[model samples]
Target: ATLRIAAMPALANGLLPRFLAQFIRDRPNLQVSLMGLPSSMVMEAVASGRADIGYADGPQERQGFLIETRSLPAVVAVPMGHRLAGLDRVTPQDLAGERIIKQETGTLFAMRVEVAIGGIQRRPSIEVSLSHTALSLVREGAGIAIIDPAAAIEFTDRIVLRPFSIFIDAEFLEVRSAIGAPSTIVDRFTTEFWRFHDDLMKQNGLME
Candidate 1:
């Protein structure tokens, strides 16, 4: 049987492909399809039985689905050579008055900003639909961005990532149907996916 997966748009390029490829290579008989969607969309797809698996940030539980979450770091990405780049970690006050690039309203990333940097008096200068876009804007000197460590993986050379002084915990959540037991293949797929994710995080120095 095919394993249909839905993932956050940012993860489509950043992490999903690698996990999918590795799983497929080892289990050639399994057919897989992936759709890149927003976190809310991923949640809906999984709940509706349109997708068998979903990777989202802060996915909400639906009546017939299960959400399993793993905590990950929340970080700030500043343009290379910016003043904050010299610091090991960023404090909320360090972001004061800095032009910020934020995610669109109602996203997990937007909520992250509200929790971590909300007290800053300066409003965001730009709001984009995706976390990767915010990271791209940081590379262009637009402003700093608050992002998950995974989303900033591709921008290592162009941005400086500093852990925030206050821990703003981001998460990677796996959503699945709770109604029945998954086939052996589906179970293995999830196990491998988690292993790949941990390895990637270690390679990025965000996990040990």
Candidate 2:
């Protein structure tokens, strides 16, 4: 059996591929095909029966697909020598007058930051499409960013990751449609994918 997977680019580059490598190694008879697309493309592929499983950020209830969602604490990314680096976390007011690097408007990341700092006149100095790019900008002292923990984990040595003072939902979800009877291989792979995340959380002492 072949398992078709459509994943957002970030997960495709990081955890998804890690899980798939181990999954195919354990189940040699199962073949796999992976596509790294944006969230909309992932949903279209899964909903139209072109893919078996899709994973990206947030729920897509409008598509009537089955989804499992998980969230990590949103963190602020600052450059190594930046003043905020010595702090454990930062509030929106702490960011006053600081140049911000962020995604485009209407994106989840942008929405969260907006709500957190809405009372003030904060605005982004640079807008980017990818979380890694936002973090890269922070790495160069371009600006600080509030982003999900995954990319921060991937770039640990270059920048500091601190929890935001206000809670924001930084979520990623796995989505699938009811096209046909589910395969046991797909089920097992899903379990493995989450298991990888759980193990990482436990390793970092982030699991409750």
Candidate 3:
């Protein structure tokens, strides 16, 4: 039987593929079905069981299983020629009047901005759904974008990136079946998943 796994778009690079490859290599019987969903949609998918596994940022509300989370450091996104490109770090004040592009599907995009730039009167240009598309827009000299450090690295050629001055908590979560679930296969998947997360963070230097 196939083990269905779903994750955030952000984890598509370092974490997702590595884990899936390792799992499939070890357990050929378990065909892995992977879905990259937005953070907001993840909650509902898990609740409905349309997705057997869900991972994303922020506190997740689930009925049975305790969702595990790992928080990561925040990063800044800027166009190649933007003034902040040369700077080592950036703050909310630095973003005033600068148009900002965000991942439309990820909840963290607006949540981070609203928290950081609280009550600021700047109408930053906002974009959503895809990170590369946002960076592409930035390439066209559209606006600045603040993304997870990983995403910045993933899209470096399209835009300049740096560590943000303000501390924003980003997360990687793993959701799965509760203690009394029907599938032993799912139980094994969750156990392997934690290992996957651990290995990914270690390889990427995000964890030790």
Candidate 4:
């Protein structure tokens, strides 16, 4: 049997494999596929039977699905050698003229950070669809980026993560089709996913 999961890059890239590492070890025939897609696509895939489960950025309340919501605080990714890297927290004014690498327009994560982006009021020097790519750009001295702590976690060696002076948060949805009964693998994976999710949130201060 195969487990199909679709999610935003923030969740799929660095986090999924880490969660799957221990999950797949015991099940010999359990195959898994992870798709890094936009939230809209994630919902579409689940609804269409292309994906068994999905984790997506918020605003995913659709008519034919079961969903769970979770939140994570935002973090600013600064290049290790950049000026902001010396700071404990990053302020809007501090980022006023700095190059900003942002998620592409109309994406869920981009929508979540709109207010913060407006506060800084700088046109993005670069835009990408994936959080890891944005972080890599930051690592290459391209610019600083405001991203979730989870996405920034894997880049610690090359970048510094500072809390945004103004509080910003992103919501995520755990979704599955309402039209079909969930599989045993899906149930087991949900348990495993949350076990890792809660720890990540707690470590990043989203939970106590």
Candidate 5:
């Protein structure tokens, strides 16, 4: 049996492996392939049949797909001793003048937060391509990162995470090609994926 999946890193990294073990444990003959694509490409993979199923922050296309959406809120992360470290929740204004480490200028993810922060969306001093890289720089005091709650849930000891004043949600999408109904394995595994998310919410308060 073969199962091919496409997803963005928030779910592609530790989260997938953590959820997969229990699911594949007894299925000795099943072979699974995982592709970590950008949000735009994850949908391409599903639509092109390069993947049997897909997961990403949000759906970019709706027609001809079976889509279910969920959300995980983002957090403001700063180095252990940064000014915002003690904050229980950080407001955008609190971030004024603090160098923001972010994605490229016009990406939806970066622009949304920039708008929330007010004023001109100045170029971030550090433009990081990967969220994990941005998180690392936050720990090093390079700048603050408004990032996926996923990484913080896994723990980055030198950085602290606080809820943001305004919502910055990674609206997750579970998508299928809709060529036919999903097989039992696909349905079963998808259920297992949500189970892991539930456990994270229960254990770490990572849910929105």
Candidate 6:
């Protein structure tokens, strides 16, 4: 038996896994499997009951009934030596003319950037995916990527990550099991997830 947890690409950085580590260690009887799905995919997985909890960027169509959301921040992923890398923050225009790495077409975040920057269709070379392939490309100088802050920080060694000067309220949709789930695991996992987030903030001096 596996607890299939679906999450955004950002969770690839061991954030989600780190948060879940002790849970699995303590509940050795429960086999936990994590799947990195696109935000859109996460929404569907939750609605269809293919996943236990889905983490996605949202304000999604399923927002009202199928999933609840946690708002996060959008961060920028730039090359180490790029001109803007040394800056404290990034702007949408900074992304203009730069080969931007985006999520696969149709993601709310990707669409937000596209619309905010005028349009992704008109952007020079917009590449897309559900993984950190965009961040990898940024490391190789293909372009910069605007992603969740957690994901941005995870690749700090390979790239220069920063916050956006402008507000881009990223929403991570924590998909609930539409049907009633075992309250014990659901309640425990939810508490742990936030505990992990709170711990991260405290370590960074943002909580204190």
Among all candidates shown, the one with the greatest lDDT:
4
Measured by TM-score, how close is model 5 to the native structure?
Answer: 0.90
What TM-score does each of the candidates earn?
0.89, 0.90, 0.73, 0.88, 0.90, 0.79
Q: Over all chains combined, what TM-score does candidate 3 have?
A: 0.73
lDDT of candidate 6? 0.70
Error of 6 at 84 (Å): 0.8
Q: Arrange candidates, best lDDT first.
A: 4, 1, 2, 5, 6, 3
Query: Which residue ranges in model 4 land beyond 4 Å of their true spot?
Result: 111-114, 117-124, 204-207
Q: Indicate the worst ten consecutive residues by lDDT in candidate 5.
A: 115-124
Highest-TM-score candidate: 2
31-101, model 6: which lDDT tens digit per residue?
77788876668777777777778777666676434555566567778888998888877776666667777
lDDT for 120 in candidate 3 is 59
Worst 10 residues of 4 by lDDT: 199-208
Stretches of candidate 6 off by over 4 Å are: 63-66, 93-97, 119-123, 201-208
lDDT of each: 0.81, 0.81, 0.68, 0.82, 0.79, 0.70
Could you give candidate 3's per-residue lDDT for residues 130-188 as a string of tens digits? 66566667778888776665455556656776767677776666776464357787767
Q: Write the per-residue lDDT of candidate 2 for residues 1-208, one digit (tens) a residue.
A: 7889998876887777877888877677877889999888889999998888998877555456888888877789999999998887788888988999877688876888788888767564798878888988999999999887765667787888777888888788788885568578778888878888878755653444
Question: 1-208 in candidate 4: lDDT tens per residue?
Answer: 9989999888888888899888988888988899989888999999999999999877776789989877667888988878888887888888888988877787666766666657766664788877889999999999888887777878887788887877676677889899986488898898778889788767754455
Residue pairs in clash, model 6: none
Q: What lDDT is obtained when candidate 3 is compared to the true structure?
A: 0.68
lDDT of 1 by residue, 1-208 (tens): 6889999877886778877887777677877899998778898888788988888877465567777777877788999889999998899889998998877877665776777776778664798987788998999999998888888887897788888887767777888988766478767878887888788778877765
The Cα error of candidate 4 at residue 60, in Å, is 2.0
Give, for candidate 3, the lowest lDDT window spanning 10 residues.
199-208
* Arranged by TM-score, best first: 2, 5, 1, 4, 6, 3
> How many clashes in each candidate?
0, 0, 3, 0, 1, 0
**Candidate 3: which stretches are off by over 4 Å?**
12-15, 25-28, 103-109, 119-121, 179-208
Output candidate 1 Cα RMSD. Answer: 2.0
